[PDB]
Design a protein around this ligand. Structure first.
Ligand code: LJA
Ligand code: CL
Length: 115
């Protein structure tokens, strides 16, 4: 059902290596809806190539637009399984510290802070 369940560790590593070769300025991001989530819709895809200069605040705005949310729908994003300490960090810096061993950066979204 989840990305890590659909693709082998070998397959995920090789896909991150191809993104380094073909899209060297992009961060490879996996974005999934929390398995408990009732309110927010599912995304149209799972794997996102994010420009490495955007900060987490801008990436939250990007995901809100992709989900076509309105002003008063709540949205919380986990990175590497936990809350973001800051939304001001460039995603290139977030990637270096929070990347998975497969080389993806894993994010999960919910309408509650309580995941
Ligand atoms: C055994 C082997 O190929 N290793 C390796 C390690 C890091 C990066 C890459 N290539 C890449 N396109 O990111 C390949
Ligand atoms: Cl690129």
């Amino acid at each position: 059902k989840t990305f890590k369940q659909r693709r082998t560790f070998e397959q995920r590593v090789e896909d991150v290596r191809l993104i380094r070769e073909q899209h060297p300025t992009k961060i490879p991001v996996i974005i999934e809806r929390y398995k408990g989530e009732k309110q927010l819709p599912v995304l149209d895809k799972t794997k996102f190539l994010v420009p490495d200069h955007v900060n987490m605040s801008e990436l939250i705005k990007i995901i809100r637009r992709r989900l076509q949310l309105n002003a008063n729908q709540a949205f919380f994003l986990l990175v590497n399984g936990h809350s973001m300490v800051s939304v001001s960090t460039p995603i290139s810096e977030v990637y270096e510290s929070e990347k998975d061993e497969d080389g993806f950066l894993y994010m999960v979204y919910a309408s509650q802070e309580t995941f």
